[PDB]
């Protein structure tokens, strides 16, 4: 997904952008319903195209490893 960067920047810079944007444009499960319709609106802002649920998550992930630890306690 980093073909827009061409022959520039190097491995790590365009490999880590590819991994992070692949797990961002991916189909994510919604906290309201259960549908895989959550897309990114901006930095940290997420929304489901089904029930119009606009929520807060990580910058590139809708759920961070630390955000899942809050549910435990």
């Amino acid at each position: 997904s980093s073909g827009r960067f061409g022959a520039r920047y190097g491995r790590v810079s365009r490999r880590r952008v590819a991994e992070i944007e692949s797990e961002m444009n991916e189909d994510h499960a919604c906290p309201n319903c259960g549908e895989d319709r959550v897309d990114r609106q901006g930095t940290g802002i997420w929304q489901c195209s089904y029930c119009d649920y606009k929520f807060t998550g990580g910058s590139y992930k809708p759920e961070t490893p630390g955000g899942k630890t809050v549910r435990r306690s």
Binding site: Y9, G44, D52, F55, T56, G58, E63, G66, V70, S73
Partner: protein
């Protein structure tokens, strides 16, 4: 010589100032007397230009539209409670005494009623550990054990926008855009690349610092550059 860059900073000129007029809200906790009967519904999720993380727009029972520091997993429609008898749910604000041990908390107050000072940046959190009648020990994002007053309010959950630091800027242009939204002069010219008149490390036929980089705490502004009061330097050892 001429005053160094760090000295021009304090004068507070345009180049060094934050674009305050383009900022949204001073994210503080609400002022409740005693009673807890203050709750509200989340209307929108907005982007905060000051911290590059999301901020939740909440409308309270008494009709007050205020922007609050959004934790992770808070959406439109969700009900948030602020007060002493508040529910132990993510996104609720209640004093450290009422919050159970081992629960990740954010937007912690230093002195009770200040509105929140600690654990405010993207994805970070403070960990509440020990309880007492006098003190509440909170472990701040740096790993420091901060002894605080149990009457200091805090919001449950980790701050939203986690993992921001994980993706590289890739290009100078992306940095440019981030920096235009902060109170920072960017790009950074190395002192070692300057003239002697401009910086203590300036001058020479080649680029290297003058004296050693580790400077004393007692050093005056204009000389305090490089490694400020370093306990040690390097990686090894």
């Amino acid at each position: 010589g001429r005053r160094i860059q760090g000295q021009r900073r304090g004068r507070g000129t345009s180049t060094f100032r934050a674009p305050s007029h383009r900022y949204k809200a001073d994210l503080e906790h609400r002022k409740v007397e005693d009673g807890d009967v203050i709750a509200g519904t989340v209307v929108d999720i907005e982007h905060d230009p000051a911290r590059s993380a999301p901020v939740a727009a909440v409308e309270f029972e008494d009709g007050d539209r205020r922007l609050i520091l959004a934790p992770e997993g808070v959406g439109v429609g969700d009900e948030l409670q602020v007060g002493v008898s508040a529910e132990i749910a993510p996104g609720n604000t209640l004093p450290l005494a009422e919050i159970p041990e081992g629960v990740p908390v954010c937007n912690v107050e230093s002195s009770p009623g200040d509105g929140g000072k600690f654990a405010r940046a993207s994805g970070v959190n403070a960990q509440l550990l020990t309880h007492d009648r006098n003190v509440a020990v909170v472990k701040l994002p740096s790993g420091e054990m901060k002894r605080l007053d149990p009457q200091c309010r805090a919001t449950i959950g980790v701050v939203a926008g986690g993992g921001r630091t994980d993706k590289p800027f890739v290009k100078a242009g992306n940095k440019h855009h981030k920096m235009k939204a902060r109170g920072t002069k960017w790009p950074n010219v190395r002192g070692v690349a300057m003239n002697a008149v401009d910086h203590p490390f300036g001058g020479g036929g080649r680029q290297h610092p003058g004296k050693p980089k580790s400077i004393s705490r007692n050093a005056p502004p204009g000389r305090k550059v490089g490694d400020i009061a370093s306990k040690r330097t390097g990686r090894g050892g």
